[model samples]
Target chain A: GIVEQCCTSICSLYQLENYCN
Target chain B: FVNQHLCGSHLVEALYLVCGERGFFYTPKT
Candidate 1:
């Protein structure tokens, strides 16, 4: 399965808002 | 453990697939 890429902008969360933000 | 962070992140991704759409968990169960 392809890994799901997450971010607050597109995903709204990534376990690390600071990192992804 | 205060790893609720670990749980939420993985939990979201876990249901991103057919689980999120179809909500399929247990399959092929007799």
Candidate 2:
């Protein structure tokens, strides 16, 4: 729905750090 | 989808740093 939502989903998928990196 | 940059010396950039909306409000996803 939004960037924060996307961030939450990404974290759930274990991709938050990888995405930032 | 296949490889990665080594970033031996250059990686960080202005675009990435400013990705988040400046106002910290709802904005198009970067």
Candidate 3:
């Protein structure tokens, strides 16, 4: 039985800051 | 006991890439 799976971070700070300003 | 994960879960990873270009520009002062 698997306990978890990989998923993208919702608060991707790098991408957020790059596109924010 | 139910799930069907497609694609190679090994090498199939996520990433980011960027590119840039340059060119001449003219202003009204020209």
Error of 3 at A4 (Å): 22
lDDT of 3 at B4: 26
What TM value does chain A in model 1 reach?
0.17
Model 2 regions more than 4 Å off = A10-21, B1-30
Q: Please, what are the lDDT tens digits per residue for candidate 1 over residues B1-30?
A: 122222334634543532444443321113
What is the C-alpha lDDT profile of model 1 across A1-21, one tens digit per residue?
112233212233223232311
Which is the leading candidate under TM-score? 1
lDDT of 2 by residue, B1-30 (tens): 222222211222322433333322233355
List clashing residue pairs in candidate 1: none
Candidate 2 CAPRI grade: incorrect
lDDT at A12, model 3: 31
| Predictions' DockQ, in order | 0.05, 0.10, 0.04
lDDT of 2 at B5: 29
lDDT of 3 at B17: 17
- As for TM-score, the candidate ahead, 2 or 3, is 2
Best by DockQ: 2
